[PDB]
Amino acid sequence: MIIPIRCFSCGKVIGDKWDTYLTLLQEDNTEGEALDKLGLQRYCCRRMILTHVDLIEKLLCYNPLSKQ
Amino acid sequence: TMIYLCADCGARNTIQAKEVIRCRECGHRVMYKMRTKRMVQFEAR
Amino acid sequence: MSFQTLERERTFKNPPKDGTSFPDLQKAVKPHVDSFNALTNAGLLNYAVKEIGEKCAFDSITQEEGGALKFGNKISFRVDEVQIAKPMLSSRERSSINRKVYPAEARERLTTYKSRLVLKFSWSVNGGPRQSEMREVGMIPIMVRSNRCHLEGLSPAELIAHKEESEEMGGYFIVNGIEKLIRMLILPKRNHPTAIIRPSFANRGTSYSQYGLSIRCVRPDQSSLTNTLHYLNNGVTMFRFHWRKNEYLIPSMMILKALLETSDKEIFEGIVGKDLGNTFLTDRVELMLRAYKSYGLYSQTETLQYLGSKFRVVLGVAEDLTDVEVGRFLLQKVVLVHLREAKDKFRLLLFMIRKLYALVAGECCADNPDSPQHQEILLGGFLYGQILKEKIEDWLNSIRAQINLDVRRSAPGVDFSDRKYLTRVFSKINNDIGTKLQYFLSTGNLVSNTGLDLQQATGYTVVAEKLNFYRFLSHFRMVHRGAFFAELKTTTVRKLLPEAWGFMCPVHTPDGSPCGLLNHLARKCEIVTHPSDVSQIPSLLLSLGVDPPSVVGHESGWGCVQLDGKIVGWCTYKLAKHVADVLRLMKIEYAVKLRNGTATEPAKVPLDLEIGYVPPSHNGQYPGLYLFSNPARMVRPVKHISTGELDMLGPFEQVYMDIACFPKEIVPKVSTHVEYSPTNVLSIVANMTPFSDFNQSPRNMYQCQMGKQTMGTPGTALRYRTDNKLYRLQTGQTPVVRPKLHNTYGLDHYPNGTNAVVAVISYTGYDMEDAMILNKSAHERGFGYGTVYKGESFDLSQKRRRGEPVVHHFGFAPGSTPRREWLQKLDADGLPFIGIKLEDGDPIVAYYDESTGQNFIETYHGTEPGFVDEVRLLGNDVGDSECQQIHVKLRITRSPIIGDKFSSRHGQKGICSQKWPTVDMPFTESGMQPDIIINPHAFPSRMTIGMFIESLAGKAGACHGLAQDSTPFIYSEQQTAADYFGEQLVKAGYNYHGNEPMYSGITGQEMKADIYIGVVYYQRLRHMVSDKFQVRTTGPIHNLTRQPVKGRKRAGGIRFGEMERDAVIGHGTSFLMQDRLMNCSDYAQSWVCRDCGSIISIMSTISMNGVGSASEVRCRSCAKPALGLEDTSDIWQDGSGKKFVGGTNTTLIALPSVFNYLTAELTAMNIKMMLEVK
DNA sequence: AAGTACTTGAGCTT
DNA sequence: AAGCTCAAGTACTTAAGCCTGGTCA
RNA sequence: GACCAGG
Ligand SMILES: [Zn+2]
Ligand SMILES: [Zn+2]
Ligand SMILES: [Zn+2]
């Protein structure tokens, strides 16, 4: 679901480092190297906010309390 | 009496025991219960 | 390639309201739902019910020496059409708008997805009024997202607004809430007269021979039956057919003369028209002709009356109407159905008998019917339509028998014109067929009076366990060839014999017992299910130089041409190949015209057609040009080389076409076809295993069969799924190595596992013998964090005995309730607090009887702390009922516990062994602790070098920010894939072979040799704690023998014997044997009579005296009656009051209870064992 | 299917 | 005549362990 | 107890 705070191998915090990653591909025309501007030099903490499925935004559109 | 939710229409229906279950506006035949205020503890592990 | 993310996120935030994003999943489900659409439209049911005919009844006045018995009031009723309305609200209107019922309410209310099934009944009143009436015939299922569901063509927005998940595929009948499905089975080829050599034939018919000819003919409505030729040593051939589970055996010359009013010279010149007087055939045909001349008759009338008087009894035809048309009826119904015209049946049967004699003539090879060559696929909807046709035939014949009973009684009410009569008759008989269908789909017992040419009667349906998406697909794609062949133990048809290349996957087929049987279809092999129009094909054939001989003529050189079971003409074989060539070119040209600008007229040659040119050759398959045009076959696409456009072909062209598999492999003058991309060869699930062409095929097979069970995301709509056991992997992510088809099929919605920095190293010492390790810090920071959902249901409807009305209800009956746990958990309504943690011994629902008024209880019988997420008060039905069902969905949590199997994508299933601490792990010059340590000694002897390649690819992809494309067959021998990924890595900065220098953790010094660190995808498996551990200290026992029960749900004990006995009794541990096999399981103290030697004869004494001494047991059989004066000591009495004397030799021997049970049953067989003691 | 031992009838010799 | 070994032919039980799930009438 | 699953 949500971004896995505190990436697995290392201990860096990457919670806040997705909503500012997504608006780099979105509007900067950059490639996957965009995340390098975020301060991720290793490649353990880099296979986290690169290849993570944010599978919540497809799941939050299921409220039973829709009132509609 | 309790509070439930219409599965389709989503309307609080306040049904009492030994009653005809149905959505009082929808005609639907399924009701979820709603989570009330309850104090539970979970270890952060 | 690059990670499509901005497209993924934008499709997530606001689903596409235009068109379902990933179309190829729909093109994958296409077979089933298209079969069902072809049920409803394209006139499938209609043709069937029409071909049932009409069924008759009438008042019988015995012929009485007349022969023509007179009968006035004869009704022959007929079924006009069948209608399957959209599933509306429950059958009757109930004080509201009759609303549609989406499958959501099907899955929640835990009941099936039914719809009204209407019949159009017609009359004949021994006249012509033919008045009609619409009949309610119960309710039948309907395929989700079919032409009869309320979701077809609905755009994913309208789906997520309902309770299905965006890329719903549909295709499954819902029954009680467990999505059942009709597996595709494999059948013999339609209409194509094949040969058989199988030993049973001869020794069944001792004059018979293994040489036989089989043909599976099918009417236009897909109501096939099989009629085979059995050849006998004498020279005659018997024309096998099968009717109502009854074999039938008629001679071919008989039926041949019966068909057409013919001259026997026409028969011969049809059989051996050639090379006049070729000795073999011209003698065998002479022998057959004399043999039939022996006892037969001459004319068509006489023969037809012979046959009719023969068959009249078994045939369910009208008892009266005729006997000549009964003969024209048997030749209409059983002999050859796919042919409509009689003369054409005649021509084709001549072809068949010529081919069979050729088969004995050794000039034709033995066809191998157990190959995808002569094989076809029965879709789900076609079987559904055939079973519906059969249940309808039964219904008609049943009301026919009922009216016959009304005529039989004496004449209670007899006016076949009056409607009231028929409404009464309909009232009497069972008028529900829908429930028969629903029972079929629930279990699968195809119970029909005739098997419809399907060998096994059972197993047609399988639950669609949505456990993980790959399993969902591989349910929809797969096939299975039947348990009849399964039970046979042979290295036969379970072999992957190669005429399947691109038809049915070679790699993926499960391990274990069914290995080799169920072959999942290839990635692109469709199943063409919508037939076409092909009359223009005979037109164009006869226009193309081939003409059928009206005058009986036949030569040597000429061969045969047949359009899926019809003699069209004859041709010289070189012309045959030229005809095939020009026809195929016409097919491709007009199709590629139909796609683009050019308007669409009726297609001359339908693309699906596979022109079956069978070349001639010595000792070869018999050559007959085969122009097949039917559905229920397999068809796969390729690119045509002389043109540059698509072309599709079926399982005849493979064996005779030079299909080049690489654009650079093409050799001119031979290669007529080029494969799109050999990726198109494998299946779906097998395709998405990167570098699938570097592994030893057993390992790709393991990884295929075991990826179908990943604990992955079973979708996204989980709030509205009442399935029994669902698994959700809290934090899954996209593979860094992914074959581009993995994005095209849109799996990214449905990830399966995570990406672990796997350092190949043997350092911990724990990770040997195929196990592995798991870096504890990663295990606690959220590695594969499983969540199980167990939705258990409670139904007061069943537990009421009978008689008195609805009694029990949920809640707290007026009266007190316990405080200690009840009021803690259960809210007030007997429904538990939402989200309160439950421990095994604790209630989940509270219901009370009205009579006793005392609340009952049911506790959480699971033995592991579970939570509660949602409780659903399943309303009963249309309305006006009490809450008679609850559905509680318990959310068990399961972190990776030691034993929870993990697996890379190449077959390396392991165990998380020790969860090694994070600081005691190795580490590199950069600082990343490798999260999961795999073992080096596991890569040889398994040949999973593909995994090392995957490691390279992952460490390359993660660095730069690429998504390394790893489809099979891309990287050739000139430049290795290793070299390309290594160039990438040395660009990034790390070593070029993939190595990296790692210092150990507990000593601090470097490892002398470098170590391997990659980025693999570890799709976690599903076997952790439920399966694993059962302990039995003391517990429940067996009613009969007091041995512990066979449980794990009833604390059942583990079995120890019949080889465990040999183990110890080799060890020489008689005491251990006597201990385990006797002492711990079933121990007892039983008394025996030493005098008589019987164990049943012991009875403990009753009413000896006051309290006094203890009951001293005695023996009845050795005791004599109490008549006479005897001393007070030895006497004793009986519960009924009898006194006896004798039977005092009762000692106390240990004896396993099972021997007591054996004594009981044995003496029930009247024989008793007399055991001595000394 | 595999294969076992089982049992009955038809042909040859005193 | 009929005694008596010879022949194919008719009845007839087994096909590894476990273990765990599920659905079913 | 029977049919599909699974190690
Ligand atoms: Zn890290
Ligand atoms: Zn409602
Ligand atoms: Zn005795």
Find out whether C135 and C119 touch, Cβ atoms under 8 Å: yes
CB pair distance less than 8 Å for A58 and C166? yes
Å from the C701 CA to the E15 C1'? 28
Closest CA of chain C from A26, distance in Å: 7
Residue found under tokens 């169920």: C518
Tell me, yes or no, whether C164 and C177 share the same domain: no
C439 beta partners? none
C947 and C974, same domain (yes or no):
yes
The C-alpha of C1020 sits at a distance from chain A's nearest C-alpha, in angstroms, of: 16
Tell me the domain boundaries of chain B. Answer: 1-45
Distance measured from the CA of protein residue C495 to the C1' of nucleotide F2, in angstroms? 30
Strand partners, C611: C627
C-alpha–C-alpha distance, residues C182 and C33, integer Å: 11
Is B19 part of the contact surface with chain C (CB cutoff 8 Å)?
A: yes
**Which bases on strand E have an atom closer than 7 Å to a protein beta carbon?**
9, 17-25
B-chain CB neighbours of C89 within 8 Å are 27
Quick one: C798 and C943 in the same domain?
no
Assess whether C1045 (CB) lies less than 7 A from strand F. Answer: no
Strand F contacts in C 664-723 (CB under 7 A): 705-706, 709
Q: Cβ atoms within 10 A of the Cβ of C859, count? A: 15
Which region, left, alpha or beta, applies to residue C947 given φ > 0 means left and ψ of -120 to 50 means alpha?
A: alpha
The CA distance from C920 to the nearest CA of chain A, in Å, is 14
Indicate which ligand has the atom closest to the C-alpha of B4: 2
E strand or H helix at C1141: strand C1139-1142
Nucleotide E3 C1' to residue C208 CA (A): 38
Nearest CA in chain A to C962: A32
Residue C615 and residue C549 in contact, taking contact as beta carbons nearer than 8 Å:
no
To which H or E segment does residue C216 belong? strand C216-217
Closest residue by C-alpha to C1' distance, nucleotide E24: C443
According to the entry, how was the structure determined?
A: cryo-EM
Q: Which of residues 1-45 of B touch A (CB under 8 A)?
A: 5, 7, 10-11, 32, 34
Nearest CB neighbour to B21, from listed C834, C837, C882: C882
Q: How far is the CA of B25 from the centre of ligand 2 (A)?
A: 6
d(CA C820, CA C823): 7
- Spatial neighbors of B43 by CB under 8 A, at least 6 apart, are none
Tell me, yes or no, whether C1131 and C1049 share the same domain.
yes
Selected residue of C5, C7, C758, C1018 to mutate for chain A interface (largest A Cβ count, 10 A): C5
**CB spacing of B40 vs C875 below 8 angstroms:** no
Q: What is the DSSP string of C745-811?
A: TTGGGS---EEEEEEE---SSS--TT-B---HHHHHTTSS-EEEEEEEEE-HHHHS-SSS-S--EES
CA atoms within 13 A on the CB side of C697: 8
Cα(C508)–Cα(C518) distance, integer angstroms: 9
At residue C83, the 3 state secondary structure works out as strand
Task: Give the three-class secondary structure for C1073.
Answer: helix
Of C47, C148, C28, C655, the residue nearest C372 (C-alpha) = C655
Question: At C630, which amino acid appears?
Answer: N
Q: Which of B4, B5, B31, B33 to mutate to test the interface with A (most CBs of A within 10 A)?
A: B5
The structure tokens listed for B25 are 């506006």
- Residue B14 exposed, middle or buried by CB count within 10 Å (0-12, 13-18, 19+): exposed
The verdict on a CB contact (< 8 Å) between A57 and C731 is: no
Backbone angles phi, psi at C135, to 5 degrees: -120, 130
Q: Which nucleotide is nearest to C443 (CA to C1')?
A: E24
Q: What is the DSSP string of C389-439?
A: HHHHHHHHHHHHHHHHHHHHSS-SS--TT-HHHHHHHHHHS----HHHHHH
* Angstrom distance, C1029 CA to F3 C1': 28
Residue C146 token pair? 């079919």
C389/C334 same-domain check: no
Which residue of chain A comes nearest to C752, CA vs CA? Answer: A53
Quick one: which of C810, C805, C804 has its CA closest to C874? C810
**Cβ contact C717:C779 at 8 Å:** no
- Domain tally for chain C? 8
- In angstroms, the CA C221 to CA C48 distance is 6
The sign of the dihedral angle between the CA atoms of C94, C96, C97, C100 is negative
CB C562 within 8 A of CB C625: yes
Instruction: Name the residue closest to the C1' of E15 by its CA.
Output: C489
3-state secondary structure C1021-1047: CCCCCCCCCCCCCCCCECCCCCCECCC
Q: How far is the CA of C1105 from the centre of ligand 3 (A)?
A: 23
Which chains have 3 or more CB–CB distances shorter than 8 Å to chain B? Answer: A, C
Residue B17, helix vs strand vs coil: coil
Residue B25 distance to chain C (closest CA, Å): 10
Straight-line distance from CA C1043 to C1' D9, in Å? 55
What the block records as the tokens of C274 is 């050639």
String of DSSP letters for C535-585: THHHHHHHHTT----SS----SSEEEEESSS-EEEEEEHHHHHHHHHHHHH
Residues C441, C180 contacting (CB under 8 angstroms): yes
* Tokens matching residue C615: 């070349």
C706 and C726 both lie in a single domain: no
Whether C610 has its CB under 8 Å from any CB of chain B: the answer is no
- B32/C872 Cβ within 8 A: yes
> Distance from CA of residue C823 to its chain's centroid?
47
Measured from the CB, is C482 under 7 Å from any atom of strand F?
Answer: no
Tell me if chain B has a CB within 8 Å of the CB of C948.
no
Residue B9 among known ligand-binding residues: yes
Rounded to 10°, the helix C945-960/C977-988 angle is 30
Distance CA C1146, CA C1085 (A): 12
Two structure tokens written together for C623: 């050559």
Would you tell me how many other CB atoms lie within 10 Å of the CB of residue C1069?
13
Q: How many A/B residue pairs have CB atoms within 8 Å? A: 12
**Domain extent for C1030:** 684-715+732-785+896-1036
Three-state SS at C132:
strand
Distance from CA of A10 to the nearest CA of C (A): 6
Closest among A38, A55, A54 to A46, alpha carbons compared: A38
Cα radius of gyration rounded to whole Å, chain B: 14
Q: Which nucleotides of F are covered by protein (CB under 7 A)?
A: 3-7
- C347 and C214, same structural domain? yes
Distance from the CA of B30 to the center of ligand 2, in angstroms? 8
Cβ separation C5–A10 shorter than 8 A: no
> Which residue, C509, C620, C637, C511, is CA-closest to C573?
C620
DSSP line for C615-662: ---TTB---EEEEE--SSS-BEEEEESSSSSEEEE-TTTGGGS-EESS
Torsion of CA C1024, C1025, C1027, C1030, to 10 degrees: 150
User: Pick from C15, C734, C959: which is nearest to A51 by CB?
Assistant: C734
Which structure tokens are listed for C1123? 């008549």
Calculate Rg over the CA atoms of chain C: 37
Place of tokens 């097998």: C686
Q: Is A7 known as a binding-site position?
A: yes
Cα Rg for chain A, rounded, in angstroms? Answer: 14
Q: Which residues of B22-36 are buried (b: 16+ CB within 10 A; e: fewer)?
A: bbeebbbbbbbbeee
Q: Which of A50, A30, A17, A15 is nearest to C1015 (CA)?
A: A50
Residue B40 in marked binding region: no
Helix axes C23-40, C380-408, angle to 10 degrees: 20
A44 is in an annotated binding site: yes
Task: Fill in the amino acid letter for C406.
Answer: D
Size of interface B-C (CB pairs under 8 A): 81
